[PDB]
Amino acid sequence: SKMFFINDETPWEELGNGIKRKVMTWSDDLMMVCVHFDKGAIGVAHKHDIHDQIAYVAAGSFEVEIEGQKRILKAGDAYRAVKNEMHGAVSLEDNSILIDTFNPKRDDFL
Amino acid sequence: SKMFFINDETPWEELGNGIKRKVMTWSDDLMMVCVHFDKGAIGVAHKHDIHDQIAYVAAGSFEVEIEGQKRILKAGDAYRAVKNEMHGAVSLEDNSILIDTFNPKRDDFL
Ligand code: NI
Ligand code: NI
């Protein structure tokens, strides 16, 4: 069941390059994902054609770039990238975590 | 601009009864909100007719009840309540935080 996500009962998916992920839970219209970064790990710049995204900085800190605007964000901050906005991130410290949320769900994560 | 949410630049909205909130950022189809609870503060059981909700436990811990199922959740865990599922929460420690995400946005938070 995806009603309750228990972090310590869910393994990491290794993405390579210092990044790993867990798909947490979802409905058709809403999905949450945990992304863990080592220090200096780079989330490559990309965009989503049909998904809006809001990322919460749960731990550590990042330099985030969205449509050419760079900002340093720390735990408790967040950012939005709507459909077709280019966004990327660089982790500034070990054990930095983004909680990514999407509308609709990411079919490619299932 | 709602592209970047900076926690230390955004004041709390006091809800009473040991709970306070910040609307973080949103698009039409996606919204993120920070909810801070004192120890023992109760998020009353309720449901949303048209919103799906996923809550991340950012800090502290909660006893969460969804459609009669009670679970203790701690920082890093999460839960889902889809449209018309009854959900509530009780904070088990000071400075416990939920990051609530919704589809679509909550018009009533603006
Ligand atoms: Ni993205
Ligand atoms: Ni709710």
Side-chain angles (χ1 to χ4, degrees):
Chain A
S1 169
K2 317 174 277 260
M3 176 175 285
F4 297 102
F5 172 76
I6 310 300
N7 192 42
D8 292 344
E9 297 172 7
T10 305
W12 296 105
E13 185 187 335
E14 297 282 354
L15 306 188
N17 292 111
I19 308 180
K20 53 190 185 177
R21 165 179 73 222
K22 307 177 189 186
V23 176
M24 296 163 66
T25 184
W26 66 96
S27 72
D28 284 344
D29 298 299
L30 188 61
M31 174 178 269
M32 189 175 276
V33 179
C34 176
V35 191
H36 183 283
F37 295 71
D38 296 339
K39 183 176 182 175
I42 300 164
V44 72
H46 67 283
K47 56 174 67 184
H48 310 290
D49 194 38
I50 69 155
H51 299 86
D52 282 355
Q53 181 186 314
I54 298 174
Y56 174 67
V57 185
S61 57
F62 293 87
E63 185 165 65
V64 174
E65 187 171 18
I66 308 176
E67 287 294 315
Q69 301 183 39
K70 284 185 172 160
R71 297 289 293 274
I72 297 169
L73 305 182
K74 65 182 170 63
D77 295 343
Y79 64 93
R80 179 190 72 200
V82 298
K83 288 174 282 300
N84 287 311
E85 291 184 328
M86 193 69 26
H87 58 286
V90 179
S91 172
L92 305 178
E93 56 189 292
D94 283 322
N95 301 124
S96 296
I97 293 177
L98 296 173
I99 305 301
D100 286 334
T101 71
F102 301 93
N103 163 258
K105 70 178 183 300
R106 289 279 299 272
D107 293 349
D108 59 311
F109 283 174
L110 300 182
Chain B
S1 169
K2 317 174 277 260
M3 176 175 285
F4 297 102
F5 172 76
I6 310 300
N7 192 42
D8 292 344
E9 297 172 7
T10 305
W12 296 105
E13 185 187 335
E14 297 282 354
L15 306 188
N17 292 111
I19 308 180
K20 53 190 185 177
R21 165 179 73 222
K22 307 177 189 186
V23 176
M24 296 163 66
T25 184
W26 66 96
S27 72
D28 284 344
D29 298 299
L30 188 61
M31 174 178 269
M32 189 175 276
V33 179
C34 176
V35 191
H36 183 283
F37 295 71
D38 296 339
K39 183 177 182 175
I42 300 164
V44 72
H46 67 283
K47 56 174 67 184
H48 310 290
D49 194 38
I50 69 155
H51 299 86
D52 282 355
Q53 181 186 314
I54 298 174
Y56 174 67
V57 185
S61 57
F62 293 87
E63 185 164 65
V64 174
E65 187 171 18
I66 308 176
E67 287 294 315
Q69 301 183 39
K70 284 185 172 160
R71 297 289 293 274
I72 297 169
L73 305 182
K74 65 182 170 63
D77 295 343
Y79 64 93
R80 179 190 72 200
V82 298
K83 288 174 282 300
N84 287 311
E85 291 184 328
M86 193 69 26
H87 58 286
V90 179
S91 172
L92 305 178
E93 56 189 292
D94 283 322
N95 301 124
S96 296
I97 293 177
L98 296 173
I99 305 301
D100 286 334
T101 71
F102 301 93
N103 163 258
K105 70 178 183 300
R106 289 279 299 272
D107 293 349
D108 59 311
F109 283 174
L110 300 182

